[PDB]
């Protein structure tokens, strides 16, 4: 599957948040596995669609590595 | 990661759609990889949140097997 945070984001079409995530501790897929909702609140990532895609991706990333 | 369609759905919290999906050709994770939006339209799965979770999961399932 996608090998970089950027590649992951591109795949679910949310590369617009790449620069946000990396400036606040989300640089690798390994970091991205640790994402949860209140961080999205803090990052002002408030679109419920974006948020559902992001958290679903993180959960499945943790599950299937 | 989750090994059954039902386990996957449970994980992203959408087990309510299990019975829908299986009655229309989505019985395994292998089948679920083939999901796309217009099938959700046909299955009257119209919540945009549910739909984003479902399709994100399917895309990532295809990508990381």
Residue numbers in the entry:
A (entry chain A), B (entry chain A): 253 to 317
Task: Please give the exact wording used by the authors of the publication that reports this structure.
The multifunctional adaptor protein SLy1 (SH3 domain-containing protein expressed in lymphocytes 1), also known as SASH3 (SAM and SH3 domain containing protein 3), is exclusively expressed in lymphocytes and plays different roles in various lymphocyte subsets. SLy1 is 380 amino acids in length and contains a bipartite nuclear localization signal (NLS), a Src homology 3 (SH3) and a sterile alpha motif (SAM) domain, which makes SLy1 a prototypical adaptor protein. In the current report, we show that the SAM domain of SLy1 self-associates to form a distinct dimer with an affinity much stronger than reported previously for homodimerization of other SAM domains.
The first variant is referred to as SAMwt and contains the SAM domain (P254–Y316), the five residues D317-E321 succeeding it in SLy1, and an N-terminal glycine from the tag. In parallel, we determined the crystal structure of SAMwt to a resolution of 2.05 Å. The structure belongs to the tetragonal space group P 41 21 2 with one molecule in the asymmetric unit. The final structure comprised 65 of the expected 69 residues (P254–D317 plus the N-terminal glycine). No electron density was visible for T318–E321 in the weighted 2Fo-Fc map, most likely because of conformational flexibility at the termini. The 3D-structure adopts the typical five helix bundle of a SAM domain with the following secondary structure elements: α1 (L257–R263), α3 (L281–F284), α4 (E289–E294) and α5 (P300–Y316). In addition, a composite helix c2 (E267–L274) was identified consisting of a 310-helix (E267–H269) and an α-helical segment (T270–L274). The highest dissociation free energy was obtained for a crystallographic dimer with 2-fold crystallographic symmetry in which helices α5 and α5′ point in the same direction and are located in close proximity to each other. A free energy gain of 4.7 kcal mol−1 and a buried surface area of ~870 Å2 upon SAMwt symmetric dimer formation were obtained. Hydrogen bonds and salt bridges between amino acids in helices α1 and α5′ and between P300 and Q301 at the N-terminus of helices α5 and α5′, respectively, stabilize the dimer interface.
